Amino acid sequence: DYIVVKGAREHNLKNIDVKIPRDKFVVITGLSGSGASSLAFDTIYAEGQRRYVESLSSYARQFLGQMEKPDVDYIDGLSPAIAIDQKTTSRNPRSTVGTVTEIYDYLRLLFARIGTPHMEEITPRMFSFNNPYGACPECTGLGSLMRIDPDLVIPDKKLSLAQGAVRASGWNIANDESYARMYIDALAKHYNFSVDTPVEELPPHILDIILYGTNGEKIKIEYERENEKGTFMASFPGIINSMERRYKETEVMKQYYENFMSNIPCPVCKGARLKKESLAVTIGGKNIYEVCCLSIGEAKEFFANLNLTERQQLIARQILKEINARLGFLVDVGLDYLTLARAAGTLSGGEAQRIRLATQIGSGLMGVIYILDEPSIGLHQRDNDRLLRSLKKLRDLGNTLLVVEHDEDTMYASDYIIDLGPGAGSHGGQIVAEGTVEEIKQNPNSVTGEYLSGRKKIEVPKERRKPNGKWLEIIGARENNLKNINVRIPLGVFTCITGVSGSGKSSLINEILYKRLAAELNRASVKPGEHDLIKGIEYLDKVIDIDQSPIGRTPRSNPATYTGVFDFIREIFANTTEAKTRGYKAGRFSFNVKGGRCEACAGDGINKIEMHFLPDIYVPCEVCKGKRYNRETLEVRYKGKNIAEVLDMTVEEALEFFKNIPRIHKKIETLYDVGLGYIKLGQSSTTLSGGEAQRVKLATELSRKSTGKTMYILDEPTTGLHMADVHRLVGILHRLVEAGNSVVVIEHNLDVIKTADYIIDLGPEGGSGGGLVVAEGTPEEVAKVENSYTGQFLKKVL
Amino acid sequence: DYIVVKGAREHNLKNIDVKIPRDKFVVITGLSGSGASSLAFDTIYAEGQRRYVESLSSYARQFLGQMEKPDVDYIDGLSPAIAIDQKTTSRNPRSTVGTVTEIYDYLRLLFARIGTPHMEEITPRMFSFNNPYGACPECTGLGSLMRIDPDLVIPDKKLSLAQGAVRASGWNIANDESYARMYIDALAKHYNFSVDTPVEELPPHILDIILYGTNGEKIKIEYERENEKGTFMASFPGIINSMERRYKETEVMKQYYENFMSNIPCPVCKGARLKKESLAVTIGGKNIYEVCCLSIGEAKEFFANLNLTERQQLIARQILKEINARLGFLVDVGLDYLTLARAAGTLSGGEAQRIRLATQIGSGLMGVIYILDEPSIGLHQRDNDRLLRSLKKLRDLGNTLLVVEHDEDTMYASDYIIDLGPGAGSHGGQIVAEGTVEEIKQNPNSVTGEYLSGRKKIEVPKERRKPNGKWLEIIGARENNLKNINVRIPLGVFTCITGVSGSGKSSLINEILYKRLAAELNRASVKPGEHDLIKGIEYLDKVIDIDQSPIGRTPRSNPATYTGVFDFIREIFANTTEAKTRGYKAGRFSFNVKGGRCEACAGDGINKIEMHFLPDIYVPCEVCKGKRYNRETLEVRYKGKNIAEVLDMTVEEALEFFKNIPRIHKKIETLYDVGLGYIKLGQSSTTLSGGEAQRVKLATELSRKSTGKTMYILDEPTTGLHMADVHRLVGILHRLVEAGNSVVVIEHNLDVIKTADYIIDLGPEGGSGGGLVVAEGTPEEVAKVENSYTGQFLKKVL
DNA sequence: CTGTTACGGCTCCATATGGAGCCGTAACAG
DNA sequence: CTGTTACGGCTCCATATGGAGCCGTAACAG
Numbered sequence A, B: 001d002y003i004v005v006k007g008a009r010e011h012n013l014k015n016i017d018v019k020i021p022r023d024k025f026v027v028i029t030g031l032s033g034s035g036a037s038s039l040a041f042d043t044i045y046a047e048g049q050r051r052y053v054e055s056l057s058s059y060a061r062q063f064l065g066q067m068e069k070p071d072v073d074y075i076d077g078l079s080p081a082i083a084i085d086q087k088t089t090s091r092n093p094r095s096t097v098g099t100v101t102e103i104y105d106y107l108r109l110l111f112a113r114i115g116t117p118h119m120e121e122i123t124p125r126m127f128s129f130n131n132p133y134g135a136c137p138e139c140t141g142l143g144s145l146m147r148i149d150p151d152l153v154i155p156d157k158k159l160s161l162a163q164g165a166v167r168a169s170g171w172n173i174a175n176d177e178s179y180a181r182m183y184i185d186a187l188a189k190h191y192n193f194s195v196d197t198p199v200e201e202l203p204p205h206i207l208d209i210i211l212y213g214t215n216g217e218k219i220k221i222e223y224e225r226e227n228e229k230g231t232f233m234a235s236f237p238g239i240i241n242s243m244e245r246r247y248k249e250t251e252v253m254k255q256y257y258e259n260f261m262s263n264i265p266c267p268v269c270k271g272a273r274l275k276k277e278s279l280a281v282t283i284g285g286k287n288i289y290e291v292c293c294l295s296i297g298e299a300k301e302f303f304a305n306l307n308l309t310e311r312q313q314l315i316a317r318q319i320l321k322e323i324n325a326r327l328g329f330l331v332d333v334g335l336d337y338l339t340l341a342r343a344a345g346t347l348s349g350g351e352a353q354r355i356r357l358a359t360q361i362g363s364g365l366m367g368v369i370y371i372l373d374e375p376s377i378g379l380h381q382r383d384n385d386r387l388l389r390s391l392k393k394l395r396d397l398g399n400t401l402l403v404v405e406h407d408e409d410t411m412y413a414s415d416y417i418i419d420l421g422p423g424a425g426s427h428g429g430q431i432v433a434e435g436t437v438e439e440i441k442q443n444p445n446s447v448t449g450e451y452l453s454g455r456k457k458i459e460v461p462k463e464r465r466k467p468n469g470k471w472l473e474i475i476g477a478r479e480n481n482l483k484n485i486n487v488r489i490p491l492g493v494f495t496c497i498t499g500v501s502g503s504g505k506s507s508l509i510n511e512i513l514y515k516r517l518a519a520e521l522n523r524a525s526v527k528p529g530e531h532d533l534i535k536g537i538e539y540l541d542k543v544i545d546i547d548q549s550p551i552g553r554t555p556r557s558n559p560a561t562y563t564g565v566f567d568f569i570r571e572i573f574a575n576t577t578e579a580k581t582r583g584y585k586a587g588r589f590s591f592n593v594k595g596g597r598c599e600a601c602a603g604d605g606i607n608k609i610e611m612h613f614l615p616d617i618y619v620p621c622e623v624c625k626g627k628r629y630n631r632e633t634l635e636v637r638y639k640g641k642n643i644a645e646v647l648d649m650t651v652e653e654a655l656e657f658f659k660n661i662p663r664i665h666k667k668i669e670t671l672y673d674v675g676l677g678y679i680k681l682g683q684s685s686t687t688l689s690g691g692e693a694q695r696v697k698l699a700t701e702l703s704r705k706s707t708g709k710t711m712y713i714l715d716e717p718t719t720g721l722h723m724a725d726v727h728r729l730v731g732i733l734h735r736l737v738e739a740g741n742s743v744v745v746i747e748h749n750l751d752v753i754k755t756a757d758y759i760i761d762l763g764p765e766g767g768s769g770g771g772l773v774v775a776e777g778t779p780e781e782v783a784k785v786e787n788s789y790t791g792q793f794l795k796k797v798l
Numbered sequence C, D: 001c002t003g004t005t006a007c008g009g010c011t012c013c014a015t016a017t018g019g020a021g022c023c024g025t026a027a028c029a030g
Ligand SMILES: Nc1ncnc2c1ncn2[C@@H]1O[C@H](COP(=O)(O)OP(=O)(O)NP(=O)(O)O)[C@@H](O)[C@H]1O
Pocket: A337, A346, A348, A350, A351, A378, A379, A480, A481, A500, A501, A502, A503, A504, A505, A506, A507, A508, A766, A767, A768
């Protein structure tokens, strides 16, 4: 009844020995980068998944790929592990919310059993859109055909074919020797048409033939190369047909192809995804599509109030009970505004995670260890009780939860807390304390216990800043479920936008404000939202978005060169006596130009070795021993250390080393302020997590010279941060605001909210019922509003 | 604590409602085809696997494919399911027995920790052959390079290039327009060589250039087609190089490629799979390869008797304990003769299943339902106690076993028995009885209880046949572990070959006797085994092997046309008054020739419909409604039924219908005798299981006119058969022997053994210790031998 | 010195024909 | 009538080039 883990060496773990109780609610807590998330996901989930995959069929194991074993001695008493974290994918159009939650099948069963028609017999398999019997013939069950408009094909019909008329990738005729150019020349020769005449003056038949091919006509096409020539017979498919075939054959490429394609609803079924005859069967005056289009809460209400005869109740008791239970679970999780007809692709991370949690609750799996990553993220404070009750119900049926959460309310409901610390990175990785909440609070050495007992807390400000007369106004915001509202955001103050889950705040910000600001100032190409007008553009210089996206897709970028301190370091290295004597330059001491980098590894530092029946394995270079530089570059020294030693130095040690140089001390102090004192100046960007990337971006913004006309947009920066990290982030944001800029943060944590300078609340509910503005102004003014959940919470906090 | 299954409609299940207790030893029993195996595998395992896969990552779900949901209402309380059945795959050479059993890692740990050298430091990752650090450089860790001998390239060097010198597929120059022929012509033009001169007279340099390519040389190659011509520049890779690339890029193709390739051991490491320096570290005077080459039992004995100092025992207590426990589990399963260096590819179904069972025992997963398919198959009677103890130990750590077994000893050890009957196919599919063994025995209606109580039993024969002087002698059998023995097999009597597991009987039969008989009489091309001579070939006409291999890979073959009764049925249909009036022919009434089959479905009867983002779905044809015939053919009738009704008729109903025609009555009675009275004459071969195919083959052999010079070879025909099926098979085999033929059966069940006419025993143990002959003669004579396990068992049986 | 803009260089990720087996049929021998 | 052999017909499974983003560097203005 214990999951004994002995000898854990993954990442930065200091060979800990932890005994986690089984079939209980266990929460693992630690600072950002302390190693708790690593200890959970990379050790326990990986071991369980590897064991179950190996126990399964070999072909399925090869299909799922090869999973490396964890660097752990042995683990005793492990059950199969299911990981529920914030992830999303395009998946397929065949998948919707209803079929993911396994409720559409029960709806089909109910319709086939007790539904009445208004001809083949009614069958449960008929109502499904995945079978040819019930699928709409025109839209083949998708319900929305995909096509590319001719307008998007050529951005400028006046321009000629070679002038840049092919905006789509893979078909441009810019290259003379390109296959597309050869095909275009062959088509022009066959049609006796000249490239000089643009599409505007060309006959429509010629353009149609070019776009949709020759419709099976076979013509002789001659190809040329540097030293090869010949002729072959083939039929041109067309640019649109080839693009459609390429899209159907196969993420980035899919997005690029869909950028030029505008989906439209099927006209035969109007998006019902079913045959016209299949919708004849109706229950209570409503067909299947109408029920699927209803929101979860009102659908549950309609099913509860549904009346039926004795025979109907006898024949459909089980289906009705199961549907009611599943809808109750869906409501209890917190998604009472979703519609069963909504495509699963257009779902946020939190909504998808909650949907998966509800599906796992409804499935009824027993004896499975569950690993969760902050279920409370992206969820309002008022739903914490519902989420905790749902988690307790899920655990009670014979499961255990290894929830990695830092919320204060979660700590008071768990049965076992494991704390990792004391610091982060190399400083942490040890089990400082563990036990129930009382023992953690009594423990003085525990980092979480100090914040829980109240020894350290975020003090509310006593004086709040006021607007200086510069305002930004949004008029006619009608995107998604917004009910044509007008919002005023003051400039020069810390602005926080709150609201009930799914109220439309995230849409209103991302799809409208950031996109319009980028298109108006950054000179980008992004489709804006559905808004009337925006006033206050002239008050801004540029807009910067901070997110947890990776800062680099290549191992040639590290924080030292991203922040910009690398150039200053190289200047000092090249301005030494030895470099001047040898006639070196500041560009020599960098692993991105020929002359200084190691020749064997081409400056990457990692060599590639391939095996006969194994994926390529990366090995450290032997010539340079992974130092990324040759002997000549490493010969020079500066105060006892060479370039490799500086690159392999932590932030605090670098600050201690460069105390005499202010132009670098400033940048290193900026990096240290955001709490990145444990990383080194040579860590590859591909190994940087989301929090590290966000902190690096914040440090970069801090280092810049503020002009007082910069707008920062943040989308829940407190995703994956402890209380101390929250305090540090609040301090950094206040410093940024005091610098002379304005910050807009979509935050749900009460600690950040209570220290804001201007609060905009969107409600009063979620889904179509919300989209309005309830309260505005300072938090003190908002707390006085009776009909506002955020106001009541702020009244309790303050 | 119950796995409640309600409304099961898979295959032939009659909507059963079963409540299986949790965390217990449950055995599901039934006749061959009754539906027990379906009810287990297709319902419970499928539902559990689908639930766990859907609970996992979406990309992994797509990688593993789409699994159709079972036709079941709902299942309550299901844990993840792992299926352990007789399956095998080529896998990869990187996988051996040791790494599958997860013991090689512990051996590496022990060698790195306490092993002593005789240079970089010793590291656990160095000893592995999957990393470049310790892998042999020449053989890249495989230990046996793969190459194709030049002799196998051309079967006849005297013949010219176009005379059939390219025996390998994909490179023949028979087709004038083939790419291979064009490449050969281009090479001949470049080398100024003629095709008339064969390889015997051609210079060796030209042959080497042809085989291994031009070694990067670029030449102009001209290609021609029906109406296309041109030239291109390319470098010839060579036939051998292209074949190697094709093999490396990617089962049937792999086997075909390996047929022309003779694997040889690596000369640098002599198959040690490691660098010469890595084998320097030795423990107790033995390196890693020597330990891996030892058998399991002697390796366990060596580890048990190993002595170490106090510090060594303190530092390697856990590794030694785990290795000893794993080797003890391996011995207890029954595989005490295997070597850890043996490749996993060359393993039988039973050995692989037992290895997987031992690995699952060692892993120690908890809260997982285990489904097993006759673990006792391919195992001697003396190891049943060990296997049962192993299964009980596996269950005791918090698991349940849904073992589908029919062995008598298993019934007396289980905690719950579920019986399906009464018959098979449409006749069965109902839960006749369930409970403990006592209640099953007391139940009169239970099919298994009647055999268990002793009401029905296989009576031992009182008079046994004797050899007639015709004998078959094998001289110098040295294949595999056979110790150059000579065996005498009498002809005209029922011969059964027994022995301890892994004694070499299966090798001695399959790799030598059947292959030589086929090559000498059937005029086949199969490499025989390592034997000196065989005497008695002139006494035989042909040899027939009966196995559970599928009889057809296409839906155009059914038992009606395989047995040959279809031609006789069509003759009577064409010999009616209506057919004569219409001028029809006997070939019209068949779905394999144009004229009678449905035009829309081309006689297959199933139409194909493809979706945009879904795999192609098969749908019954709408024009013919799946009758596979047009209206004109179905118009004719014979005694009130048409051809479709005859095809859709069961065996017993067909026997009742055709009582007046003896030439069809004989064949239908033959089919009914082997117990296939529940199938229909229109079932596709692709849907036929192994037992059905074996019974169809037996019926086909029975139908043939016996000439008294036929040899039948069977390899465990009782794999997946109940006691009644065993009795029927024994009766059929006795009928075959009485017909005038000789049957050789490698059987382990005592019921078949006790009714044999001649018993050949191989022992006295398995592995290298066995391979000899212990006892020979009638079972009564064998039972008197004291030093024979089979004789000891037959003493109690008789 | 310090910030900005523009240009050049570099890297990772993306997009139809032959062979084995079975069925039907003609011819022949018992 | 019936078994055997040989031939023809049919079917399923198998085998290199452009674009987005980051880094280094020259030029210019405060
Ligand atoms: N692609 C879409 N198509 C249609 N409606 C959408 C789409 N995306 C969002 N919506 C609607 O817009 C509402 C608000 O979405 P959004 O603003 O992203 O929510 P949110 O406040 O971030 N919710 P949460 O994740 O709980 O924090 C949703 O409740 C939907 O009703």
